Design a protein around this ligand. Structure first.
Ligand SMILES: C[S@@+](CC[C@H](N)C(=O)[O-])C[C@H]1O[C@@H](n2cnc3c(N)ncnc32)[C@H](O)[C@@H]1O
Ligand SMILES: O=S(=O)(c1ccc2c(c1)CN[C@@H](CF)C2)N1CCSCC1
Length: 264
């Protein structure tokens, strides 16, 4: 309770535009360099889905924040998608892009790169069209509660698959809390279901405007073990080491991990 209400307090200052700018605009957001983290992440999301292994009807994105890139390759495999976030402002920022409102963040370069990578000959507008169509709702959530979505959420539970990028470690004061939060969201997944977990490796802080957030520094092994401890079978685990040119003043992240896990 103490460690959670403290994080919750820091997030009250979280500025979406500042977050988007620090991470999804160049240099980290430059998709032209094949060696950048942007191309690497999109590639690993596309290859995972191209296997045909991850499919079903409903999907939940845990801690969406103001981003949708994590769902570009996923959207053509799930007709009902639920996006979520703890903050009102992020859910509003998402709405601005989903409803094509004014001031929405421009994700077009990412959509185009996902199309380029997938190689199905799809134009980026159709991709965004399909994502917007399949995202049925944007709900509040708290991975710290035993029932993250709450009592009677509109979300079709359990889900056939889950996606979570940079949420758990960024809202957990320590490894133990990270483990619990993972246990918590795992209850939202159907047995045999899939979890695509993405996050920061050995990171301890990051900025988002006037907000300065703490992060729990986790390692690939710690993540692997935590996944096992939560009833998962790790189908794939990859690490991307942050090169010097992508190490800016916005945080102290050392690498990024990708975990494809199956609830057994
Ligand atoms: C660094 S962001 C990750 C956003 C996005 N998934 C991405 O890939 O960039 C962390 C997100 O977790 C949200 N969050 C904060 N406290 C949370 C909590 N207790 N439960 C769930 N999400 C929370 C924040 O509002 C924020 O959108
Ligand atoms: O690896 S990123 O640079 C990235 C993307 C998001 C974040 C971080 C790093 C590190 N701090 C996280 C907050 F804890 C947020 N990349 C941004 C371009 S698209 C793939 C993800």
């Amino acid at each position: 309770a103490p460690g959670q209400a403290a994080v919750a307090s820091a997030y009250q200052r979280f500025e979406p535009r500042a977050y988007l700018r620090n991470n999804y605009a160049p240099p980290r957001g430059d998709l032209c360099n094949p060696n950048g983290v942007g191309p690497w992440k999109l590639r690993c999301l596309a290859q995972t889905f191209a296997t045909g292994e991850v499919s079903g009807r409903t999907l939940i994105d845990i801690g969406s924040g103001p981003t949708v890139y994590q769902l570009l390759s996923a959207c053509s495999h799930f007709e009902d998608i639920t996006m979520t976030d703890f903050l009102e402002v992020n859910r509003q920022e998402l709405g601005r892009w989903l409803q094509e409102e004014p001031g929405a963040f421009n994700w077009s370069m990412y959509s185009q790169h996902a199309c380029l990578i997938e190689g199905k000959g799809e134009c980026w507008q159709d991709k965004e069209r399909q994502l917007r169509a399949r995202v049925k709702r944007v709900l509040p959530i708290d991975v710290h509660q035993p029932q993250p979505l709450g009592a009677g959420s509109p979300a079709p539970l359990p889900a056939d698959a889950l996606v979570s990028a940079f949420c758990l470690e960024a809202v957990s004061p320590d490894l133990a809390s990270f483990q619990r939060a993972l246990d918590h969201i795992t209850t939202l997944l159907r047995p045999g279901g899939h979890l695509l977990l993405i996050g920061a490796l050995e990171e301890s802080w990051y900025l988002a405007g006037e907000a300065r957030l703490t992060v729990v520094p986790v390692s690939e092994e710690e993540v692997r073990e935590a996944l096992v401890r939560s009833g998962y079978k790790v189908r794939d685990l990859r690490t991307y080491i942050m090169p010097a040119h992508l190490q800016t003043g916005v945080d102290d992240v050392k690498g990024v991990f990708f975990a494809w896990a199956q609830k057994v």
